[PDB]
């Protein structure tokens, strides 16, 4: 069902995460970690302290899809062999994340969702780190195919 999912998403904040390659999202799905540029690191840390759940929704550039979404379980902390586009010293710290859905979603399926915080452009459109408004972000997550391998019981207890 979708009920535990909706509970996790209740009053969450949402951020669009753009990756230049699939290898970095694969690493993040395997290791439960993410790292971003300091400008986005600061925004995510602020949001982590501010809300019950901070959701990162991942899209690989030029893939035409989202690759899933995850919940921040920590602030950033200061090695991961990211495929950098840019040096490793340029990155901020590492966030721990818990995946909520590792399934992909094609942009064609979110064409009816616009993001008020990016001029009501379709939610697929945005820079890395763009915040997605609550209602748009919730509906986007509900569009993903259910990931029956994930048990949100252990995510709920971290809220």
């Amino acid at each position: 069902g979708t009920s535990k999912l909706k509970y996790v998403l209740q009053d969450a904040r949402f951020f669009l995460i753009k990756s230049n390659n699939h290898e970095n999202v694969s690493l993040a799905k395997a290791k439960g970690v993410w790292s971003t540029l300091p400008v986005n690191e600061k925004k995510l840390n602020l949001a982590f302290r501010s809300a019950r759940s901070v959701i990162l929704i991942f899209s690989v550039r030029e893939s035409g899809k989202f690759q899933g979404f995850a919940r921040l379980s920590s602030e950033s902390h200061h090695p991961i062999h990211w495929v950098l586009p840019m040096s490793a010293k340029m990155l901020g710290g590492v966030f721990k994340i818990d995946w909520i859905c590792r399934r992909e979603l094609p942009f064609t399926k979110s064409a009816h969702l616009t993001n008020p915080w990016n001029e009501h452009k379709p939610v697929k459109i945005g820079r890395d780190g763009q915040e997605i408004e609550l209602e748009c972000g919730t509906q986007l997550c509900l569009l993903f195919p259910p990931d029956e391998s994930i048990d949100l019981y252990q995510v709920i207890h971290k809220m």
Side-chain angles (χ1 to χ4, degrees), residues 1-22 24-30 32-51 53-61 63-83 85-86 88 90-95 97-108 110-126 128-134 136-156 158-159:
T2 60
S3 295
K4 286 204 297 287
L5 174 53
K6 289 168 162 146
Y7 185 82
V8 175
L9 299 187
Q10 246 293 317
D11 294 305
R13 300 182 63 174
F14 302 84
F15 292 86
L16 180 69
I17 298 301
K18 290 296 181 63
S19 184
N20 44 317
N21 52 70
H22 279 282
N24 287 337
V25 170
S26 173
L27 287 151
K29 288 184 174 170
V33 292
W34 191 246
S35 185
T36 192
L37 281 175
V39 63
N40 287 336
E41 174 189 29
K42 289 187 191 65
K43 289 158 46 171
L44 292 186
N45 280 330
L46 280 167
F48 182 80
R49 307 157 189 149
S50 89
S53 288
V54 174
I55 304 303
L56 312 184
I57 311 177
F58 290 83
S59 182
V60 172
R61 301 182 175 291
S63 76
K65 310 178 189 178
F66 306 92
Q67 281 68 41
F69 58 98
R71 181 188 176 277
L72 288 193
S73 66
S74 89
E75 295 185 26
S76 70
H77 296 286
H78 300 262
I80 301 151
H81 301 318
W82 306 114
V83 169
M86 182 201 167
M90 295 195 202
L91 289 162
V94 166
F95 297 86
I97 63 179
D98 291 308
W99 286 87
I100 297 164
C101 173
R102 289 188 181 84
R103 312 269 310 265
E104 68 189 24
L105 181 80
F107 288 165
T108 57
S110 57
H112 62 292
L113 298 181
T114 54
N115 182 6
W117 300 154
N118 196 24
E119 307 181 46
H120 283 93
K121 294 167 170 179
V123 64
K124 78 171 179 189
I125 298 303
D128 183 43
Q130 170 72 59
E131 187 164 2
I132 305 173
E133 174 272 333
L134 164 72
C136 180
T138 302
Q139 291 314 315
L140 178 51
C141 289
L142 289 168
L143 279 178
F144 283 77
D147 186 340
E148 301 300 331
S149 73
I150 285 168
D151 186 350
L152 293 181
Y153 176 79
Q154 290 87 356
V155 161
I156 281 178
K158 301 178 181 186
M159 312 181 30

